[PDB]
Write a protein that binds this ligand. Structure first.
Ligand SMILES: Nc1ncnc2c1ncn2[C@@H]1O[C@H](COP(=O)(O)OP(=O)(O)O)[C@@H](O)[C@H]1O
Ligand SMILES: [K+]
Ligand SMILES: [Mg+2]
Length: 780
């Protein structure tokens, strides 16, 4: 009665966009989450709910509550680029009927529109923290109205999860310096034990629920028997048609689900098991339906299965060999070895029902929202080690489709030996959230950085302000070291002290580090290395420049050293000079092949990182030399997933080093670097830099249009559409040495986009020419 959406004083225009697919009434917990306290007035809120319970609607009503009531700008923060991109389009579609402009600041991407001409900016953690820093230097902190944090449990421990605290703490420190509404915080996560601590730290009202529209049946199978969390038998399983192999009834379980016209997610430890399992299942699906690499069977969807394989074909990766076998039978795999474009296709196919069986890794469990009737976990041993509890809850959470299934079933297959360990996961619970700013060592990276941001930014100047900040931390909410970090910044010339007793100021090295979004620990080695490059620099190739923008803070692949030594001998003299100039000794490469001795316990054995870095720069060199992804894979021995993940990392890092050089006055160095951020992003040469401004144009399409007479956007705006269409048809990779009168493919949507409607080769060509024209006019 009262939770009817029409009784909340909702604008009429918006109320219908929600009703497009469901959403006429809310939930018991969503109405209570809004009404209790002074939350709807602007008070901060930290709420928890089970996965697939409707956490999105609660935040959205609060965001619209501020954008339209306070006429201020909102900030939506998401962990990954893939989940951030998924959220942007979902929010764009909802917030357009009232003239509300919504874009995003994600990974290497940047908005065409000014921050002043937005309403809601969608960011990742790294990019959001930088944007906040943008607002401090310009004192435009007054623009920001609220921040929404998704996955609040990443506050605890992550490669970047600590940035979430510095971000929030900075907001808590600033809002304290003005101490009617100020800055509202809406955080949400899974059930945390110390969740009450987070609500108190942020002075937020709390809400927690266990509600879930579809009941989840977590279970564990040992042999034929299936038990619940209390080891009580709930089903004695017997396989309808036996097949050979390992067979812990894995194929029979998948078959049972499909026959009831449903879909199943099958999680496997390694990337190789997923492909092997997708192959076995798809192979058995061929024999069993008929009782004894094709076209999809004739149903209502014959057209869409064909559209999917063709979209895969017209990609920079091509159509995977294993997928060509499996996809025709609604079977596929999904891991980090695949490119981000392949994974966007499969996730969409599975979400539409085109793919009924999806054998995935742990990458998907933390990825986008993707539900299924039955979830199967192959083993409690992932990567040779027992499975993490959070990963388990993320896998089994995808069981049960709201509005479709009566229940969601989860099966964890085990042996008698790993029997005890499996039950531990079903009964297990999440660990308490750590501060990631902790003291053995008096100093720590996260703390040094937090202090640098507030001093250089100019919101903490004196010594009293520092301890005022210490009160606002999540670390102090749980109930010196700060003074140690300040001295560290003094010793390394990051900060200044003047004689009005004891006031701290930023140096040029300080102001440069902040604007570059670089870590103070990393800045020291970078600053010395750059000065080293400017004393003796090679300009005949782009290798030495690439080395300066080649990131080595994390391993992106397992390098085969014997292959490396083989490429070393074949390496031209111009690139050997660059190798020597960097630190690459041939003796060390030999000592890598002969014995797999990593050593690296000693700190001066950063010698290892150097050879790893030079190996990586070679890969980046071919990448911006427009070498096919398939050649690079065979040449170096790394998958297309690792390469693409690397270039998006190097594109970002290249921008940092460029800014770092600009703030230090190093013009000559800046001048050389300022061309590789764009080239690393798309993986192109200098000529294609202009073409790739068009959204639909990537490296391959840009090359074939360049080789056909269209060099610029200007050349592309006067262009004849049907000619562009023909040129596009020529860039496609076919298995036979390719490149029936079918008047039925005049409508086949075989071209993929972002936030996509299926595009035909004709519409894509017409969109490219239309977009080229729109850009050319804005240039005058
Ligand atoms: N109050 C609601 N009433 C009906 N359906 C909802 C409601 N909130 C969300 N949904 C739908 O349920 C699905 C899952 O909810 P979601 O908000 O994704 O939960 P979570 O964010 O915890 O995964 C979404 O696709 C959404 O369209
Ligand atoms: K593009
Ligand atoms: Mg969520």
């Amino acid at each position: 009665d009262k939770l009817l959406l029409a009784n909340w004083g909702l604008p009429k225009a918006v109320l219908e966009k929600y009703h497009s697919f469901g959403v006429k009434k809310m939930f018991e917990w969503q109405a209570e989450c809004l009404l209790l306290g002074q939350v709807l007035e602007g008070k901060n809120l930290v709420y928890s709910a089970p996965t697939s319970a409707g956490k999105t609607l609660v935040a959205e009503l609060l965001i619209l509550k501020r954008v339209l009531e306070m006429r201020k700008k909102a900030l939506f923060i998401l962990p990954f680029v893939s989940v951030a991109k998924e959220k942007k389009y979902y929010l764009q579609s909802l917030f357009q009927e009232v003239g509300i402009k919504v874009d995003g600041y994600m990974g290497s991407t940047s908005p065409s529109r000014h921050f002043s001409s937005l309403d809601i900016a969608v960011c990742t953690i790294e990019r959001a923290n930088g944007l906040i820093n943008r607002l401090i230097e310009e004192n435009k902190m007054d623009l920001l109205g609220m921040v929404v944090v998704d996955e609040l449990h990443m506050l605890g421990d992550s490669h970047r999860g600590y940035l979430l605290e510095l971000l929030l703490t900075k907001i808590c420190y600033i809002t304290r310096k003005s101490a009617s509404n100020a800055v509202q915080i809406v955080g949400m996560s899974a059930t945390l034990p110390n969740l009450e601590l987070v609500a108190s730290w942020l002075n937020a009202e709390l809400y927690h629920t266990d509600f879930r529209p579809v009941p989840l049946l977590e279970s564990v199978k040992v042999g034929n028997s299936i038990y619940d969390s209390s080891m009580k038998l709930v089903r004695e399983f017997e396989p309808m048609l036996q097949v050979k192999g390992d067979e812990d009834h894995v194929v029979s379980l998948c078959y049972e689900t499909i026959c009831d016209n449903h879909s199943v997610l099958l999680f496997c430890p390694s990337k190789k098991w997923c492909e092997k399992l997708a192959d076995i299942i798809a192979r058995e699906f061929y024999n069993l339906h008929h009782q004894a690499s094709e076209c999809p069977p004739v149903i209502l969807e014959q057209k869409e299965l064909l559209e999917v394989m063709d979209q895969l074909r017209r990609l920079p990766s091509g159509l995977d060999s294993v997928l060509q076998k499996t996809v025709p039978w609604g079977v596929a795999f999904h891991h980090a070895g695949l490119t981000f474009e392949e994974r966007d296709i499969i996730e969409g196919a599975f979400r539409q029902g085109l793919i009924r069986v999806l054998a995935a890794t742990s990458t998907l469990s933390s990825g986008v929202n993707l539900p299924a009737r039955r979830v199967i976990i192959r083993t409690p041993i992932f990567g040779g080690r027992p499975l993490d509890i959070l990963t388990y809850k993320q896998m089994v959470g995808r069981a049960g489709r709201k509005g479709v299934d009566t229940v969601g079933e989860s099966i964890l297959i085990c042996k008698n030996s790993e029997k005890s360990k499996g039950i531990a996961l079903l009964q297990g619970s999440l660990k308490p959230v750590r501060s990631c700013l902790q003291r053995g060592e008096e100093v720590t990276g996260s703390m040094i950085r937090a202090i640098l941001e507030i001093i250089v930014g100019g919101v903490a100047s004196t010594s009293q302000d520092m301890h005022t900040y210490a009160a606002c931390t999540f670390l102090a909410a749980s109930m010196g070291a700060i003074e140690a970090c300040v001295m560290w910044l003094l010793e390394n010339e990051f900060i200044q002290s003047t004689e009005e007793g004891k006031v701290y100021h930023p140096t040029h090295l300080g102001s440069a580090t902040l604007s570059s979004s670089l870590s103070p620990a990393d800045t020291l080695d970078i600053f010395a290395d750059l000065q080293r490059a400017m004393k003796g620099f090679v300009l005949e190739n782009d290798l030495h420049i690439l080395y300066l923008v080649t990131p080595m803070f994390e391993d992106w692949t397992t390098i085969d050293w014997y292959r490396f030594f083989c490429l070393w001998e074949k390496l031209p003299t111009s690139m050997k000079r660059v190798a020597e100039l960097v630190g690459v000794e041939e003796g060390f490469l030999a000592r890598c092949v002969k014995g797999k001795v990593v050593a690296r316990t000693e700190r001066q054995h950063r010698q290892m990182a150097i050879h790893k870095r030079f190996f990586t720069s070679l890969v980046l060199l071919d990448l911006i030399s427009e070498v096919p992804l398939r050649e690079i894979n065979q040449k170096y021995g790394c998958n297309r997933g690792q390469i693409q993940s690397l270039q998006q990392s190097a594109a970002v890092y290249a921008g940092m080093i460029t800014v770092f050089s600009n703030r230090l006055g190093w013009h000559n160095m800046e001048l050389l670097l300022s061309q590789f951020q764009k080239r690393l992003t798309f993986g192109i040469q200098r000529e294609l830099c202009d073409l790739v401004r068009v959204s639909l144009l990537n490296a391959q399409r840009a090359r074939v249009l360049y080789a056909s007479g269209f060099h610029t956007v200007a050349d592309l705006a006067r262009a004849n559409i049907v000619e562009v269409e023909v040129i596009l048809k020529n860039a496609v990779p076919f298995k036979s040495a390719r490149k029936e009168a079918v008047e039925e493919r005049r409508n086949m949507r075989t071209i993929w986009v972002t936030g996509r409607k299926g595009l035909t080769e004709r519409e894509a060509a017409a969109l490219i020419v239309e977009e080229a024209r729109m850009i050319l006019q804005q240039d005058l």
